């Protein structure tokens, strides 16, 4: 049961567009990631910051999130560094529990299905924060798991993720971080059934022939997911139908609904 996991840049793209692709009377995509809320060091606090676009979607969850979940799509909050020098991987123990508390609170408050960690753009070490890893990234996954054990946690395989092997039982999926070409390996010791070794950039899209070939390999090699980054509001069905044929022996169709970002 390969899962299709798509990241949506909510600064540009209305997440409802993920619901416009259909394969076998179900949404093509199984997980939608609202990319992204940020971790921000503010003095000695580790903070969760939702920019106006993220916060608008969360404030309008009944119209911008719930319709996806009503279709059976799991909707996750993306988490990304934001240039303050503090990131997932250089926190002390107090900051780790602060950030875990903030994230779990966001998931419960907005009725989300989980979170995705993308350890990018933290600019580790700026503003007096540690320049290297403190080992906090593994403790953060454990803290968050303990606060919300039935919710999904995915990890984009970028940054300090190599440290996560000891905690990987708490991680549902890992996603390969480079686009349009598979790497037949996994990060942080994940089994193949919990990894996407192939991640399609839906903005700078590959050919449908490359998507069908590589997705068929994802399936025949027993991997459990395929990643998709930057679904836009155009009709990208030729690529997704390539995957449907390759990985799912099926087809994917587009319903024509291009949802605007008018907020």
Author numbering: 44 to 79, 80A, 81 to 201, 202A, 203 to 225, 226A, 227 to 306
Source paper text:
The genomes of Bacteroidales contain genes encoding glycan-degrading apparatuses that typically co-localize in discrete clusters known as polysaccharide utilization loci (PULs). B. thetaiotaomicron contains almost 300 different GHs belonging to 60 different GH families, and secretes at least six mannosyl-glycoprotein endo-β-N-acetylglucosaminidases (ENGases, endoglycosidase hereafter) that hydrolyze the chitobiose core of asparagine-linked, or N-linked, glycans (EC 3.2.1.96). Here, we discover an ENGase from the GH18 family in B. thetaiotaomicron, BT1285, encoded in a distinct PUL with its own repertoire of proteins for catabolism of the same HM N-glycan substrate as that of BT3987. Altogether, our data suggest that human gut microbes employ evolutionary strategies to express distinct ENGases in order to optimally metabolize the same N-glycan substrate in the gastroinstestinal tract.
